Subunit: 271 residues, 2 copies
């Protein structure tokens, strides 16, 4: 069995068939497992990044709400996303360009070789042959200081500078108007202090801030997401006609109002 242990001794466990890879990269320990019932598991420093049977429960709620809330998202930035799932979801939409900035090249290599949820996308980006998606190997924090003009910015990073006020100010400045930033923001129940502090810093910067939660398979459930808006976007509304064209199994745009489920004590603290 593989177990990820969280604060206070809560654990997410998977029966495993085999450990099939391990490498200490320049930034983290990368490990891949074949699980019994959830396909392959990618772990970074012993934390679950995804399971191949269930990962859409993360990548769909991370990407599509923000993409559908924006009136016409054409230029998108993804920070992290070494496994390729996030950029794959972004490309369901008719964007002009998606830039991905990932610090750890070895996560990309391990994912394209052993995980393969990206369906050839990572290889195309590494070879510079993709018509819309471009890859930069680097620090998203530095990148956003020096690069700008995005309709949507998606932080698909590991657990927590990407949650600092300094970073959010650079993000806001780099966003178009209208613009939307979204980040995974940790376990609702177990990383609660980290969620609240991130929300606090975002509220200083953005014109609107929203929170939501979703049942992500492989993570301590449910997982939190935070949204920062530049300009006039009502994140409680989505483009239903664009939504109908998407291939979705987890996020339910026709029931978009339900996205905002959150335990009461956390709702109160954030407000």
């Amino acid at each position: 069995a593989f177990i990820e242990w969280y604060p206070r001794g809560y654990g997410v466990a998977f029966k495993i068939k085999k450990k099939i890879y391990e490498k200490l990269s320049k930034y983290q320990k990368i490990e891949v497992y074949e699980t019994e019932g959830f396909g392959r598991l990618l772990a970074l420093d012993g934390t679950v990044q995804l399971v191949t049977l269930g990962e859409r429960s993360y990548h769909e709620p991370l990407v599509h709400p923000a993409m559908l809330a924006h009136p016409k998202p054409k230029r998108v930035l993804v920070i992290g996303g070494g496994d390729g799932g996030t950029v794959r979801e972004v490309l369901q939409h008719d964007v002009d360009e998606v830039i991905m900035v990932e610090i750890d090249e070895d996560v990309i290599m391990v994912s394209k070789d052993l995980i393969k949820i990206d369906n050839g996308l990572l290889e195309a980006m590494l070879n510079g042959k993709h018509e819309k998606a471009k890859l930069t190997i680097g620090d998203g924090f530095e990148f956003i200081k020096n690069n700008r003009g995005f309709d949507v910015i998606i932080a698909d990073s590991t657990d927590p500078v990407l949650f600092s006020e300094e970073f959010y100010r650079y993000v806001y400045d780099a966003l178009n108007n209208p613009g939307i930033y979204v980040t995974q923001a940790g376990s609702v129940y177990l990383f609660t202090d980290e969620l609240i502090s991130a929300y606090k810093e975002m509220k200083k910067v953005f014109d609107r801030v929203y929170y939501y939660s979703f049942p992500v398979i492989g993570y301590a459930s449910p997982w939190a997401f935070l949204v920062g808006v530049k300009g006039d976007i009502d994140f409680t509304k989505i483009d239903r006609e664009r939504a109908k064209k998407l291939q979705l199994e987890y996020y339910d745009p026709l029931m978009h109002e339900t996205l905002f489920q959150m335990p009461k004590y956390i709702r109160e603290t954030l407000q």
Copy 2:
């Protein structure tokens, strides 16, 4: 560590200090563990019933949506609920009577001694001293008795999910009335959730489904609601809701109660 394993090799795990209790009753194996960070854990046949630090994440969404959806819930039945959490939540509301029917008396005894989420309620009920709450020992299916505004099934996972049972429940409900049951893991007991929804659709005037992040269970957890007469379960009494002390269920955001993965919603329709 304690682990409860679910279908497809998914596991909910708690680091534990010690196992402090184990007894085979006439019905099941009752165990109590001391966890490192979630208080005490009560298990029946290796399945988590509750952890004391977090159990309100189950008992609140089980009880309060149905109690607030009903226009005037005065008489309530709870099937199961040996730990006392469910009846405690029902008593937040101004009910006349709440009857609790639990088959296994040993769960009540272990809960009142070792778990203590009930704040003296179980003791009061055992001695017939509580003015509103009455305890009876027996099978909920067998339990004859009718005239309830709200019936809550706080029992084990998918006899209590059969069409035959649901007809007796429907006949036992007032008009207006409302039934609610916990309905298993959304992701891992999905076929069982769908088949319970199907049986309820054959009997009740309207069936609703929702989910909630319950601490200690494979999350999220499903709940099913059957309605007799004129109750719109998408609406709740906001003014009564503001007087409850709640940490988890958020009645002012009642519309979000109905979160459910898209593929599961589509299958249910």
